[PDB]
Amino acid sequence: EIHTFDDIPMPKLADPLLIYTPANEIFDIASCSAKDIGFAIAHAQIPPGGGPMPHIHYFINEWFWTPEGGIELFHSTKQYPNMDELPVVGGAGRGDLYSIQSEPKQLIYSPNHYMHGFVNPTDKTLPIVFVWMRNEVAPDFPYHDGGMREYFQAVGPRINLPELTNAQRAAFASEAPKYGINQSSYFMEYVNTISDKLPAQIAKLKNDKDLERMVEVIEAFNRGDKSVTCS
């Protein structure tokens, strides 16, 4: 009933890019591209209470992979195809979210336009892997990846951990639309309710085909295949 995945490997860069995101996530992140495909991927460590506020993507489709479970995710059934329409009380209207208590090696797929987010509600640091695949409408970015690696590089300090400033926290939200994200700045901004009863509409979301294409790209880079680029 619950979907799992054995492994999502990390593309191994000569000099790994390490970022501490303003949502308190320890990121090891890369961008890869090849014929007709572009994506960013992060292997992350999430401290007690770390995680992004609810947000919606316009340039990417996203996979979450929780090697140890424990991470609580949030997801809508409502889709928001219009980036110019924010889901706030002062207009388009806040949404309803459903929580997911992740299990070891669970794979959660979240297409563009869905509202999602996650938190570590435990007292220990937990691993998570994110894969952000460029969709068909994404503009080009320097790494051709849909824009997510450029986003985290732009608003998050390079990695004993550096310390987050108010400007960095406020920019995590204000800079987000340049990278095809509507990012709330506080938890209840885009949110009316949170429910622990998971709708079938959410539970059945799945796209193994593209993830496996991206895995082959990563493994190809790791084997030294010059026809792909990770960077």
1, 35, 158, 166: which one binds its own copies (CB under 8 A)? 166
C-beta of 188: minimal distance to its own copies in Å?
Answer: 5
User: Is 75 assigned a ligand-binding role in the annotation?
Assistant: no
From Zn ion, its own copies, none, which one binds at residue 89 (CB under 5 to 8 Å depending on kind)? Answer: its own copies
Identify the three-state secondary structure at position 122.
coil
- Among 114, 130, 162, which residue's Cα sits nearest to residue 51? 130
Q: Given candidates 25, 28, 62, 72, which one binds its own copies under the rule CB under 8 A?
A: 72
Establish whether 62 is an annotated binding residue: yes
Position 206, amino acid = K
Choosing from 99, 106, 112, 183, the residue that interacts with its own copies (CB under 8 A) is 99
CB of 225 to its own copies, least distance (A): 42
CB 48 within 8 A of CB 122: yes
Q: Is position 170 an interface residue for its own copies (rule: CB under 8 A)? A: no
Count Cβ atoms within 10 A of the Cβ of residue 223 and give its class: 0-12 exposed, 13-18 middle, 19 or more buried: exposed
- CA angle, 157 then 158 then 159, to 5°: 115
Residue pair 44/27 in contact (Cβ under 8 Å)? The answer is yes
Three-state DSSP state, 156: coil
Q: Is 3 annotated as a binding residue?
A: yes
List of residues contacting its own copies (CB under 8 A)? 49, 72, 88-90, 94, 99, 119, 121-123, 163-164, 166, 185-189, 191-196
List of residues contacting Zn ion (CB under 5 A)? 62
